[PDB]
Design an enzyme around this catalytic site. Structure first.
Site, PDB file in Angstrom:
ATOM      1  N   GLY A  69       0.714  -1.299  -0.089  1.00 48.42           N
ATOM      2  CA  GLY A  69      -0.126   0.129  -0.183  1.00 48.42           C
ATOM      3  C   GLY A  69       0.602   1.194  -0.111  1.00 48.42           C
ATOM      4  N   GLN A  70       1.729   1.371   0.896  1.00 43.28           N
ATOM      5  CA  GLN A  70       2.711   2.409   1.156  1.00 43.28           C
ATOM      6  C   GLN A  70       3.554   2.584  -0.104  1.00 43.28           C
ATOM      7  OE1 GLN A  70       5.746   1.156   4.021  1.00 43.28           O
ATOM      8  NE2 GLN A  70       6.696   1.144   2.063  1.00 43.28           N
TER       9      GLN A  70
END
Ligand SMILES: Nc1nc2c(ncn2[C@@H]2O[C@H](COP(=O)(O)OP(=O)(O)O)[C@@H](O)[C@H]2O)c(=O)[nH]1
Length: 180
Positions: A69-70
């Site tokens: 995600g990051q």
């Protein structure tokens, strides 16, 4: 196919295949990468500060890269995305706290219509660890059961001792040898 003779193989398939390493960081791409030998050592950058590796082996291509995600995205991953013909997901058997993170990444990745016809495989790396999760618990934990039957297969292994790594590819080869 042969390699020092050893044993007469029967693999004749070649309907476009490109196995890439997708999953959470630290899952064990580094150890597995070395195992593959690394056909053509290529180092490129899609944008800003993204490190991606690419290698070619006769006809079958291979590419390794982390996801999360990051992590951000671009247009380079997409290009190779469709062109890719081999999807192999590898997660850490000792990173349960992030097992969900792997599931989500896999969930979004498997949602690619262009990859709906791609062979998917799950590999557990860290079976040598005494506190490592088993393929069964991992399979259920990552929602492997939540995905229709046929898409991908699951197998526990240990990247360090190489136990399970050979049997995992050998098995995968058979599935790739027999096309429907
Ligand atoms: N106990 C154990 N450690 C492993 C195993 N595979 C890799 N490691 C270690 O776990 C760390 C992460 O491995 P790595 O392949 O670099 O993960 P990557 O960042 O996804 O490439 C390293 O210190 C490896 O030595 C395994 O099967 N068992």
């Amino acid at each position: 196919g042969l390699f020092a003779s050893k044993l007469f193989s029967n693999l004749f398939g070649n309907k476009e295949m490109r196995i890439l390493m997708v999953g959470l960081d630290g899952a064990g791409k580094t150890t597995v990468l070395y195992k593959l030998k690394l056909g053509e050592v290529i180092t490129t950058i899609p944008t800003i500060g993204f490190n991606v590796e690419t290698v070619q082996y006769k006809n079958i291509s291979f590419t390794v890269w982390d996801v999360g995600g990051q992590d951000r995205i671009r247009s380079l991953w997409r290009h190779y995305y469709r062109n890719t013909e081999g999807v192999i997901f590898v997660v850490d058997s000792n990173d349960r706290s992030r097992i969900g993170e792997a599931r989500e990444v896999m969930q979004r990745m498997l949602n690619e219509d262009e990859l709906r016809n791609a062979a998917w495989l799950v590999f557990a790396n860290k079976q040598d660890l005494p506190e490592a999760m088993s393929a069964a618990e991992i399979t259920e934990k990552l929602g492997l059961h939540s995905i229709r039957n046929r898409p991908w297969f699951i197998q526990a292994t240990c990247a360090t001792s190489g136990e399970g790594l050979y049997e995992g590819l050998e098995w995968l080869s058979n599935s790739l040898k027999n096309s429907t």
